[PDB]
Amino acid sequence: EGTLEVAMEYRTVTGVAGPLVILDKVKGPKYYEIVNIRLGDGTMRRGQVLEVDGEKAVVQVFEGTSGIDNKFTTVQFTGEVLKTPVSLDMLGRIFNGSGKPIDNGPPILPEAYLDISGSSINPSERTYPEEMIQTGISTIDVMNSIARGQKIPLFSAAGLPHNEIAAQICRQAGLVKRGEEDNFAIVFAAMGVNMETAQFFKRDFEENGSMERVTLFLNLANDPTIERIITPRIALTTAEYLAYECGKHVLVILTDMSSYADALREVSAAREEVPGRRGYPGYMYTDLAQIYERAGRIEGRKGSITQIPILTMPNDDITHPTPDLTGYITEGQIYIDRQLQNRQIYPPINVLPSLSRLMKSAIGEGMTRRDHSDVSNQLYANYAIGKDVQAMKAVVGEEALSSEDLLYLEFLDKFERKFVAQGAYDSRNIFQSLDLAWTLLRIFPRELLHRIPGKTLDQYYSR
């Protein structure tokens, strides 16, 4: 084997500006080589070499440039890109943003060092998601369902209970069961969460007793802004190792993706890169791809990576660059409405903008019922007509609702009342909920229904 070499320690640091540390007289640099910077005080922090030109090197330190002296700090070039020591033993533990074990436990004994930002899967070898998931919440499963390998985020403005919904989904996560070793292992990324939210996550996960199959990658808002960018990379790399290289299906969760967007914006503004819309970097689409575009099923392996991000519209606007690019990349949306929260509904899922682009394959005959697609389409389409009827009633009066419009208004009322609402710990099965969905569709006459054929639901029978 090629003989090893001890990393060269330099002291030629010849410039500091912003978060970027300049070096000179570097002997044979390497792009994206991880360099750990030791200050004169002796404290150490990591960093990446962003731009390599000639014998120079423009390093981006992690813990901040503060305290770096141009004649007393030393930089050591490890000569290798960032690598996360993934291992099967990493399950049931908590790690910092960069991966420091923070559960008062010994560090990870790596089964293999794996580089973050792993290469893409050859789409010829890529396959298609073909199985539903039993998260434990009615409205997500019944309409705009989630497939074992499908990516889909949660759109929810600030202050909404989306964190509680994520915690409930993670604690109640399970297969359809229509096995425990390959059962759902949950990788729980936490980008830029509050300390109270962090303690809540830790306590809730420890309480459900599923610590044996859940990994927390916590990154608080106190941690450096650049260190938040590598947290999703590490989480997804560990998920890739667990799923493809070990077998068990992984249900990747990342909270506050808007925090990741803000971290990207801060890092880009630091280096003065070309700005896209709203001052975000012009390559944000590619970065959000490298984060999201890993969920899927690989042909030769029995693993599967399901992605459930959690975004937050900053101004409660769907047109914001982060949610817009996500919706471009994320293959569907599960939407949460503040207006429904104003009505004191615990799971404020609004179904009008919520659609799963892979639902057309999750449904079928192996699972669910043969009337799933048509019933979902009707409860998706008649809601818009009910909203239009409500608007007409608001702008004209109660007399505007004719013998047909009043039916749509009553449909909307009952749909928002009974169907959407669910218990904080209710595992409402599909058929029991689909019966009430059929009742809601049957509030309207069985002949005015245009899109659905009568025979489709007629195959199913009430009681």
Partner: protein
């Protein structure tokens, strides 16, 4: 050693500073102009100087400090007045005599020649001590005893302990050796503003911030070590709430922090605090300044000092919490701080983000706000303090859409929402119940039920009544009070009584200047219980309205009672009134 080379406005380039460190404060020129290092390109440095750089001379000396922007803590920190960059305004004025702030003042933050009474703990001359150990306490003044904590990042076996007596900060009150080398510590601790203070464990907040106002105490409670937000731009509500916090809040200390507001407004507030006086529960009369510290940086002050004032204040609050005291910070105008940060960013030509603020504004605001919380102390003996921030916001025109407002609402747990409409309608509390909220009620429910298990149910019923108040409002708006049912009329009347009797305070009146939580709880019980007892009887609304005149008067007076009689007497009176109202509602049914 070190000479300037290029002076382009605020930006300054100085050669011969190879050993300089990033963000290390430096003294520039003979006038001792103070500026922070930004870029260390080459063997040269780059400094932005806070005060005006007009009149600098090339090759004028530059003197390093080997320390970032730091604050000298210790005895004498309370009471005084300090600038943004930790400059004692009062002593500067006394020493210079004149009024103007000299360009290049060098007065130390705390007088190092004044004497304070010192006495050590029972520690021995050869014992072992570590960082955060409380080895002595000092009577800086009456009723504000100051503990002397051994500085963090310092530990070792005890070598020398100063016996009790009269001493000054320049004296070496403590000396100890970890290794064979020995270090001697005085009573002055320096700590960078940017670096937070070391903590042992971030506890869960479990005690409400009793502000003395019923609306904040019961409707939208705030917990010790919890963030708070105020949309304060007019109506003097910010002044009112600040005075309430200074006088009646549970906090053992208050650290007001004013940045970039109107100079005359800061003059008014800094003349108001000395006039403010608070009585002790033991019957003693004190001055709020004896427990108050004030950091005021007006608009005329340098922009960098305006940005650093907030961090200075929060570091002072953390130092106070280091000895387990409950201390409350009050950021006067976070909007002004954000504008100062924007000006600094424009000076640095950083790439603009949403609405012109730099992209790190939200991140820096979150980093600042994350320092609040109930925290276990570092080092023994065991004790626990808290730091709560009640920093206000000034949205432009009231539109809660500016990035400062959005970030603050995203980070702050409890938002109280002062409304100018209520101020126009002559509302002393001015708290809009329709927009305020308290996200910490779920965590505070433990204490809420421990004090009274029915109090939380009463609060939920009051929230439901407030929610139905607007419903009845448009009901009266569209058809009038005629269409209201007897139960609906009773609910509307009870909501109006709650709004005009308990949800509103009288402040200026001696009887309603301070509202104890006991009186608040009894008033809430006497209101909600009466509301229900009248509700289930549906009885003609007119008949019960006629026959409950005495009950209505009792409910109204349930807040007119002064706190002079104390909790045992007022609680008994409120209980008797509630029993009488219940008897009148039940017997007449």
């Amino acid at each position: 050693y070190g000479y300037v080379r290029k002076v382009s406005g605020p930006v300054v380039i100085a050669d011969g500073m190879n050993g300089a460190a990033m963000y290390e404060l430096v003294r520039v020129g003979h006038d001792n102009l103070i500026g922070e290092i930004i870029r260390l390109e080459g063997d040269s440095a780059t400094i932005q100087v806070y005060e005006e750089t007009a009149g600098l001379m090339v090759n004028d000396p530059v003197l390093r400090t080997h320390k970032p922007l730091s604050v000298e803590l210790g005895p004498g920190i309370l009471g005084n007045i300090f600038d943004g960059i930790q400059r004692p305004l009062k002593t500067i004025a006394i020493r210079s005599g004149d009024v103007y702030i000299p360009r290049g003042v060098s007065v130390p933050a705390l007088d190092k020649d004044t004497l304070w009474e010192f006495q050590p703990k029972k520690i021995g001359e050869g014992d072992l001590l570590t960082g955060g150990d409380l080895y002595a306490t000092v009577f800086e003044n009456s009723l504000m005893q100051h503990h002397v904590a051994l500085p963090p990042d310092a530990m070792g076996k005890v070598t020398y302990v100063a016996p009790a007596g009269q001493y000054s900060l320049k004296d070496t009150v403590l000396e100890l050796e970890f290794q064979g080398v020995k270090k001697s510590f005085t009573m002055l601790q320096a700590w960078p503003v940017r670096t937070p203070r070391p903590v042992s464990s971030k506890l869960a907040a479990d005690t409400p911030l009793l502000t003395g106002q019923r609306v904040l105490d019961a409707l939208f409670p705030s917990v010790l070590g919890g963030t708070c937000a105020i949309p304060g731009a007019f109506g003097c509500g910010k002044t009112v709430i600040s005075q309430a916090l200074s006088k009646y809040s549970n906090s053992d200390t208050v650290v007001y922090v004013g940045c970039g507001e109107r100079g005359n407004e800061m003059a008014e507030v800094l003349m108001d605090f000395p006039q403010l006086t608070m009585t002790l529960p033991d019957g003693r009369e004190e001055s709020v300044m004896k427990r108050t510290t004030l950091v005021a940086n007006t608009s005329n002050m340098p922009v960098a000092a305006r940005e650093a004032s907030i961090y200075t204040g929060i570091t002072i609050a953390e130092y106070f919490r280091d000895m387990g005291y409950n201390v409350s910070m009050m950021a006067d105008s976070t909007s002004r701080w954000a504008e100062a940060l924007r000006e600094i960013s424009g000076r640095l030509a950083e790439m603009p983000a949403d609405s012109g603020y730099p992209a790190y504004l939200a991140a820096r605001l979150a980093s600042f706000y994350e320092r609040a919380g109930k925290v276990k102390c570092l080092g023994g003996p065991e004790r626990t303090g808290s730091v709560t921030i009640v920093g206000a916001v000034s949205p432009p025109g009231g539109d809660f859409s500016d990035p400062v407002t959005s970030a603050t609402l995203s980070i702050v747990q409890v938002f109280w929402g002062l409304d100018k409409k209520l101020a126009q309608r002559k509302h002393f509390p001015s708290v809009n119940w329709l927009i305020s909220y308290s996200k910490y009620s779920t965590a505070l429910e433990s204490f809420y039920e421990q004090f009274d298990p029915d109090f939380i149910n009463i609060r939920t019923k009051a929230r439901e009544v407030l929610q139905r108040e607007d419903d009845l409002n448009e009901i009266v708006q569209l058809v009038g009070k005629d269409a209201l049912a007897e139960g609906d009329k009773i609910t509307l009347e009870t909501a109006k009584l709650l709004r005009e009797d308990y949800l509103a305070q009288n402040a200026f009146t001696p009887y309603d200047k301070f509202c104890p939580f006991y009186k608040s709880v009894w008033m809430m019980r006497n209101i909600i219980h009466f509301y229900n007892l009248a509700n289930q009887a549906v009885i003609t609304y007119t008949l019960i309205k006629h026959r409950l005149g005495d009950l209505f008067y009792r409910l109204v007076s349930q807040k007119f009672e002064d706190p002079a009689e104390g909790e045992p007497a007022l609680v008994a009176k409120f209980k008797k009134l509630h029993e009488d109202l219940t008897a009148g509602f039940r017997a007449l049914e």
